[PDB]
Design a protein around this ligand. Structure first.
Ligand code: GDP
Ligand code: CL
Ligand code: MG
Length: 155
């Protein structure tokens, strides 16, 4: 068991809140865009607190995270470009970074190739996956992957 803060970054409209809601699953909470769940992975439980807020919290945001998930939409070149900008922001401030290509189901609107997503992880030195929140594809696998990468830090 452990607890980690996972921060969701990316342009508006790429599906950050959708991915977080699927992670949260099916009022007294101070603050609103923070999602908590304990996941069982490789027979072991781990809690992630997934932050979806992308000011003291705005300044601290890129320094507090145990892991960062930078999301873009495969149907929007602009969002992919600004993904690259976000890694550099993170640099300017030893932490897992996942580059996520969301909206994989829009396979006919594809503006960003799989190869382009892969190259970008290579250039960022980080992990890569494509998901769809509307088909519920690779979402569980995204967050389970984050847990595994975090556990490689500790060991
Ligand atoms: N087709 C498709 N639409 C998605 C996907 N993820 C999110 N959306 C849609 O894109 C819009 C923006 O989603 P939202 O989660 O608010 O994006 P956010 O600004 O990054 O939080 C919503 O209308 C979603 O239904 C996806 O994987 N596939
Ligand atoms: Cl889009
Ligand atoms: Mg949102």
């Amino acid at each position: 068991m452990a607890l980690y803060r996972v921060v969701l970054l990316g342009d508006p409209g790429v599906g950050k809140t959708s991915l977080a809601s699927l992670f949260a699953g099916k009022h007294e909470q101070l603050g609103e865009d923070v999602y908590e769940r304990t996941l069982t992975v490789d027979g072991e439980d781990t809690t992630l607190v997934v932050v979806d807020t992308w000011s003291w919290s705005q300044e601290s945001c890129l320094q507090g995270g145990s892991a960062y998930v930078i999301v873009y939409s495969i149907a929007d070149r602009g969002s992919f470009e600004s993904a690259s900008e976000l890694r550099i922001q993170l640099r300017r401030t030893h932490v897992p970074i996942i580059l996520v290509g969301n909206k994989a189901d829009l396979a006919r609107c594809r503006e960003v190739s799989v190869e382009e997503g892969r190259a970008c992880a290579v250039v960022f030195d980080c992990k890569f996956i494509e998901t769809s929140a509307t088909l519920q594809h690779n979402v569980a696998e995204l967050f389970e992957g984050v847990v595994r990468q975090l556990r490689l830090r500790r060991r």
